[PDB]
Amino acid sequence: GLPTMNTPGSTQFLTSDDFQSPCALPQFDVTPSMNIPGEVKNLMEIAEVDSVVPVNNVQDTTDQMEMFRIPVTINAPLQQQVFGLRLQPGLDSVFKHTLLGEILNYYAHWSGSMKLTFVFCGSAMATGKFLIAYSPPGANPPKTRKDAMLGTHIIWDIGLQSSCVLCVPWISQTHYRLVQQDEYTSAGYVTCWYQTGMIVPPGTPNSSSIMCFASACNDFSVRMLRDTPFISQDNKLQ
Amino acid sequence: GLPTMNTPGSTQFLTSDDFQSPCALPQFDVTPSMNIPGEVKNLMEIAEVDSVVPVNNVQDTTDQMEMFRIPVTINAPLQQQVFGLRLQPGLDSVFKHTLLGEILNYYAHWSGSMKLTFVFCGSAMATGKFLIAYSPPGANPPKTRKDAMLGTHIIWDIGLQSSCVLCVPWISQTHYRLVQQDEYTSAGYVTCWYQTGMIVPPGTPNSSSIMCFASACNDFSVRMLRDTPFISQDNKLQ
Amino acid sequence: GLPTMNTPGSTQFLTSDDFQSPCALPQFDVTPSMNIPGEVKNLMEIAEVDSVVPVNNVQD
Amino acid sequence: SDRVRSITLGNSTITTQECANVVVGYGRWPTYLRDDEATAEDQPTQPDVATCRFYTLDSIKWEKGSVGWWWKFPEALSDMGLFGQNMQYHYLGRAGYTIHVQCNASKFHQGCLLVVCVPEAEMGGAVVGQAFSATAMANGDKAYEFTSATQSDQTKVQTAIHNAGMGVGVGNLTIYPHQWINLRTNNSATIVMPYINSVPMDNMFRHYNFTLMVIPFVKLDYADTASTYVPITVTVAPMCAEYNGLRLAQA
Amino acid sequence: GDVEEAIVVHVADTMRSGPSNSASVPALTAVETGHTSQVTPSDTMQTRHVKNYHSRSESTVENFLGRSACVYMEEYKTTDNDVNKKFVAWPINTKQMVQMRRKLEMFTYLRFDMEVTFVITSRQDPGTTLAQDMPVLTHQIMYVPPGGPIPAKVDDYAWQTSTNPSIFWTEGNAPARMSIPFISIGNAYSNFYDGWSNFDQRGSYGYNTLNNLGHIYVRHVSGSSPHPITSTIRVYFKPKHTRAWVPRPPRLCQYKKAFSVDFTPTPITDTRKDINTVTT
Amino acid sequence: GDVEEAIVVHVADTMRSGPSNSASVPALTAVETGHTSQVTPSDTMQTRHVKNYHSRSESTVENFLGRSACVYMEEYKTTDNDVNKKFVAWPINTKQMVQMRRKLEMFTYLRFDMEVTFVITSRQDPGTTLAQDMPVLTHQIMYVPPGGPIPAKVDDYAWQTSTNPSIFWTEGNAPARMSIPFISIGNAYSNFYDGWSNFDQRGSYGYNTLNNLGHIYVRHVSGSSPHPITSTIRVYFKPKHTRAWVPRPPRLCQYKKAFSVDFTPTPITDTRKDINTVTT
Amino acid sequence: GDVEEAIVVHVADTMRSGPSNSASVPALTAVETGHTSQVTPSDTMQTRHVKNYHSRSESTVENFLGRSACVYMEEYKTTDNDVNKKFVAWPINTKQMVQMRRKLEMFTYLRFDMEVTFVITSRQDPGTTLAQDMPVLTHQIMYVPPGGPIPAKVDDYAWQTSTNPSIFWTEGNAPARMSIPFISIGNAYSNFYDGWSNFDQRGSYGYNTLNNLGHIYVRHVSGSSPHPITSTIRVYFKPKHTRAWVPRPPRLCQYKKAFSVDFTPTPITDTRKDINTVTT
Amino acid sequence: GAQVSTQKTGAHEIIHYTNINYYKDAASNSANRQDFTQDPSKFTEPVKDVMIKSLPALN
Amino acid sequence: GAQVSTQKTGAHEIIHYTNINYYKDAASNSANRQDFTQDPSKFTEPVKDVMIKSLPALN
Amino acid sequence: GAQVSTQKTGAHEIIHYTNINYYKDAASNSANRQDFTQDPSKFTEPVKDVMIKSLPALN
Ligand SMILES: CCCCCCCCCCCCCCCC(=O)O
Ligand SMILES: CCCCCCCCCCCCCCCC(=O)O
Ligand SMILES: CCCCCCCCCCCCCCCC(=O)O
Ligand SMILES: CCCCCCCCCCCCCC(=O)O
Ligand SMILES: CCCCCCCCCCCCCC(=O)O
Ligand SMILES: CCCCCCCCCCCCCC(=O)O
């Protein structure tokens, strides 16, 4: 017949190949298709939805739900820190298990900007201002409010609108960053400080809580599929 | 299906083959290209750059840098030899490790002409003339300046222009020469002699130095890749 | 992929076959050709030249 | 005459009356980053004349026994004018450079210097293995000296001159952008270096873009004169500098 | 014309933004509406113009689920005293192996074709005497849709498939492979089923009610060595032409049952010294 | 039209030159400018007209680097008491083998696709009793991008790759092969990196900081012979579609570390009797 | 148009000839001129008209030399005490085997491409104990152009070819094969060279001076059996696209040296009883 | 019956491949992984009244 | 979707070969080793002012 | 890029075959053994003055 010669790679089984194969059930009639609501075509669509971030990981939380709410008090020194965290969406315990971190943990590289949304859940009569800042990578994280205000930041005024958005820009030397972030691909820090202080009238609770939401922007993307390290087994399930 | 028959060479692994193979990371998005300065597309571009030739290999050099400078003196016999060397760019110790010899040592055949550039690094008040000659292959290298002047040569006058170029022509019986040159593919000799002598005024050093640069012309070419013998290992690096 | 089936003679080495094979020295530049005198293209050209015949084989 | 050159950057000027041509990197002139190659999103800052100007990098002595020196950039300018301040306050940076080396001597002196800019001049330690701190090869504008003999102290780099501290033949450094100062005909060398890297921008404290080396191939010599040494001076001017990522002062 | 030549997106670019002072407040919103804010860095700080060539090609569900993953392995011996130990019988399901299970359960309904690959290896069992000569072995893989006859021993009559599809494979060749269409009675596969089997809310509960995909059987065709030999089979699934609906959050707790959602409560995440700790 | 038929240089010729007597001095130049002279033999002696058909086809970087070269080999046994000795785990890098390392380090930055080929061979270990019968062995090669789970033993759960690419290969066939795209986060691979990891100039130094390419793991799928068997794997790399920037001089000193430039000083070249010696 | 369809001689016919009586004398000639007579039977006797369909297709040099012929064989063992006996190292030449040597030396200069085929076979060495189990062996063929490094032992570093071409072949498959272009420095290969190496007519003499084609090395990749195994390799050459110049008479005396023309005088031919003997 | 279509390449640098189907069942074809359309509005903007980003969310 | 191009031959003596791509990723293609363009001016003539070979290098 | 040419047959009795080149080097092609031109005059008639067979060789 037609002369041929086999090249390297013949008879190998590569788990990510694309080849045609015979059908074991010839002329099988499949069930008609139906347009079920809520079709998802790309995982970034899932990644772009907000999810509550457990910022309050203080190592002595006897109640798990306490992790989601950030404490706030009426009387505090003029400049004081509300919270601080590292911007490692796929590695930091804060973002590790969120709806965005779970998607990232299936991939090796990521790039793009992020949205952090903060919502004030105090009384309607309470008021205050907060300074939320993003500090790009450096040798030392900010220690005081004067250090923090030198970076990207927004002044948040609490009023009828209960929510404010800090958009973390994509500032990097490389087009992509590793999910298993190392010192070479650091991403910076995020901190929140009192701007004016929280004031309340008579007959209101003396403490309030804030919550944080994390999601990706429309320029976010991922690359290089890999297996997630969060799930494992020791024996075959039965 | 389609009848076929395998021919000799099936299932072999030839290290220099050109075949298509499946991609292990389907639909991977590569980083955008960027035009970094200094793109090199052909090794001859590297080979055409000048490099300092260590001509002074006198077997008693306690200082390595002394190899690069060729001594010269004010008072010398009327005819005297400055230096002499064999024209074996890929085998001679003089040219072995230069920027041209290193490239040649990756190949088996070579052809084309060469440039030798000499620069005088004496005082501004010093003066002299030198005769630089190329003697094609023969049974005996030149012994005196009258023997040398019968071959290709140039008279070099030292003045405001500090450099002179001896272009070694391609005179050969075969289109190509072996890098591991043998007696069959000899290439000749290069020698330099005093033409008039070096003269200096009062208040100047009595000795001076010359340096040599080697490079290929625009008709140079190589052939038949091979492994270089200059680098070896005895155990796996760790 | 494309279904196929091997026929008799696969993987054999026949010394008088004509098949293409990979080149071990890709993009090698051969020396230019030169017209040397006296090219021979067919052995009958040699056979048509005269040669002396040793007829006197008389065993002594 | 083509032996005269004049360069004007910012509020500073350089004049040379006895010089060779100018070498321009790899044929590329410094330029700003384009819109289709950038990755960072926030607006850059371009100080212009405040930073793109000539800075004089201290001076050294050329003796009969000198072996060579090197400087690492942009660390050498880390504390020089507003260039240093912008380096301190920003996460990312990008700039080309103009390097001018001055060395003058009478007509009765002799000697030759090689001036070369080596991109990514990674160096090895004196003792195989081990490690050295970032003080054995860069401590500001101070110059570091090569050594004729093999280095023995484990706390510093292998300074053997004939290997250039990189494991390569010193005679092959001609492949990089370079120029020669030959006292017969030359007093200064000028090199224009574009920004060369594998990424559009990089942190100017963490990464050494390139290294400047000055090596005497033909040692200095003279006779019967009152001048005992020949000073060498280095001047550098950033070009088309821009920064990104304002993050308070930090190393 | 024989060739049909008639048969790329890139993420959004960044636009230049300057100083602003106006009544519009893009940064302020209200999450109570269930609406995710669509602000971009251009709306809260000055930005340069950037052209993005990044694409989301590798994040599509087709590529995300288009990787072969192991779903089952078992061992069977060529000769032994126990009849049940000389062949395998597996009720097809995707809940046996944790990784592919978690990948699939990120969606509620799935519809795809399937590509199945079988990897078979053999080894001689240890013993006091191993010297034997045995030709190459051959294996049979049989698929029995629900309700069909099931073999009870290695040499039963049921192995003479006249209508059940089968594959005969000889050791030393490439692994066996085939394609399977969408064989669900419903309009889509369901990973989860919050309901009962009986109409009065009794009986089996959960996904177990909708698993009626059949069985797979494997044996050595006629190999029976003087000394025992053990073979292992691995089954790999690879969805093709995938469609998914109704995404759901990834699982947090470890799996404990192959046909149940049962779990043990797990902490939300790991802890740190205090709310301000940012160092390593 | 189905066929796209729309898809050689030769070196410069030598021109005839006669006697000359003029003020032009092509031979005299000045190297101080950093300029390499462009003189040709036609400019300093009488020459004949010569047509050159020589081409520089084989000197291109594509052809220079387009040869498969070994980058790693290691051994693993089918059965043994030490768990760590039954499989391999290699952090991918190109500095292990000297020849290809030196070929690559002639350039500062490289950008290419990769073609990887695996050669696997097996041999029986010596012993007092070797008589056994064992079927053909099968091997698995697993690639784990950085941050993924790593197997700790030959029969770990991690080997059930659902997203990590893998290859299953049976002895006696052609060697395995695949293609890999340009997988660097930066715009080009960097052979050299003169910098530190931490922002205050501390920590790791050199090329070691930018090596985050992942790992490769290998094992026998299920082979476990009564007597030990040792297998060796060799990995070959072959750049494709290559581009290079900023050439640098070839190394002179021998290599001594796999992740450092450390060296011992070496003489510039070999010596000879005196500056006039020209004989053998 | 995709197909290039645009891409047989027969010997001379015999013409009818009748009686003649004339002054022309085609039969009479003079060999002293060096001219071979062109007479035909039509010129000396009456002949009939004959159409000849015979062709000289099989006498062309392309077909004459286009047959694979053995040029070298050698043996090497998988394990042994002598290091030099575990691999082969052959300086390439065509004078080793008599038949192809004589075929080639009918011409003075040749120019052709080459097709090389390798045939490898293995056998177990005899001994007092032969019971072992060994997987399939693998072999490497390495080509080293002149001047390259040469391996000194079976496990040397030189076997990690980064630029030398090589082939890895597994037993049981088709023989290895490749193509080689015209790799001579001169414009044609020379079978004979009447000259010396040194310019003063001294040193090596003959064809030995122009043989600089390189070496070929072969080894078992990693096979090392408990008991010795011997393998033999045979090399076959097959010219392609052949051109030849200056034919010379075939050799009469037997060959005695592989790199010399040395011989012993031989009689012109065999004898017979007398000049008139015509019987058997 | 041969389809010709572009194959994926990076950034902005014969980038064509040919495909033919051999089997009679559409399930036998190779994966159709060249489609890149997406629309996140179903999950990010499920509200009834359209919300303008520049305007206040409420009132 | 078949490319036809010349194959390398010596000196000045059907010298055509056919190529078809089978895979959807450009990384799967064979090496493009037929390009022979080169320009050494970047390394041999990096000076600013053009230098004429026949004229003196300086003055 | 397919060549079509006649294949050898005996005497005077679809005698066509098709060939395609797969490799980029002309050395990889198959043997070109279909050429049958020949000219023995170089060895049989090397004399300067033309000799007529019917005429006497000398005078
Ligand atoms: C939500 C999970 C649904 C899983 C659906 C799996 C459908 C594929 C079943 C294939 C079983 C038969 C394969 C082997 C057939 C044979 O050997 O001929
Ligand atoms: C400067 C040196 C850079 C080296 C870059 C090497 C990139 C290739 C890495 C390939 C690793 C994976 C190969 C095996 C994959 C598999 O088995 O499926
Ligand atoms: C007059 C006689 C001339 C003989 C010329 C022979 C030229 C062919 C040499 C081929 C040597 C290399 C073959 C093996 C290469 C490999 O294993 O990759
Ligand atoms: C079962 C189908 C086998 C097809 C074999 C390869 C194609 C041969 C015909 C050449 C391509 C033309 C196809 C077409 O006309 O659409
Ligand atoms: C996966 C592609 C398989 C292609 C099989 C060989 C080509 C068959 C069709 C004949 C050539 C025509 C190709 C074309 O129309 O561009
Ligand atoms: C590497 C080349 C592979 C060619 C595969 C066989 C030919 C397929 C296309 C059908 C023939 C048309 C060829 C042509 O257009 O010239």
Author numbering:
A (entry chain C), B (entry chain C): 1 to 238
C (entry chain C): 1 to 60
D (entry chain B): 10 to 260
E (entry chain A), F (entry chain A), G (entry chain A): 1 to 7, 11 to 283
H (entry chain D), I (entry chain D), J (entry chain D): 2 to 14, 24 to 69
Sentences from the paper on this structure:
Coxsackievirus A9 (CVA9) belongs to the Enterovirus genus, species Enterovirus B (EV-B) in the family Picornaviridae. Like other picornaviruses, CVA9 has a small, ~30-nm-diameter, nonenveloped viral capsid. Its positive-sense single-stranded RNA genome is ~7,500 bases long and encodes 4 structural proteins (VP1 to 4) and 7 nonstructural proteins (2A to C and 3A to D). During cell entry, enterovirus capsids undergo conformational changes leading to expansion, formation of large pores, externalization of VP1 N termini, and loss of the lipid factor from VP1.
To evaluate structural changes in the CVA9 virions induced by different treatments, we solved cryo-EM structures of the most populated classes from intact, faf-BSA-treated, and ion-treated CVA9 data sets to 2.9, 3.5, and 3.3 Å resolution, respectively. Similar to the X-ray structure, the intact virion reconstruction showed elongated density for a lipid factor placed in the hydrophobic pocket in VP1, as well as a large portion of the myristoyl (MYR) group covalently attached to the VP4 N terminus. Furthermore, the base-stacking interaction between vRNA and VP2 Trp38 next to the 2-fold axis inside the intact virion could be clearly observed. The average radius of the intact virion, 15.6 nm, coincided well with the geometric radius measured in AF4 experiments. As expected, the main particle population in the control data set was that of intact particles (89%), but there were also expanded particles containing viral genome (5%) and empty nonexpanded capsids observed (6%). In the intact virion, the RNA was tethered to the capsid via the VP2 Trp38, but it also was in close contact all over the capsid interior. SYBR green II interacts with free nonencapsidated RNA, or it can access vRNA due to the pores in the expanded capsids. In Dulbecco’s phosphate-buffered saline (DPBS), the virions were stable for 3 h according to the very low fluorescence readout throughout the measurement. In the control sample, 8.8% of the spectral counts for the structural proteins corresponded to VP4 (13 spectra out of 134), which agreed well with the stoichiometry-based calculations from the virion amino acid composition, where VP4 accounted for 7.8% of the total.
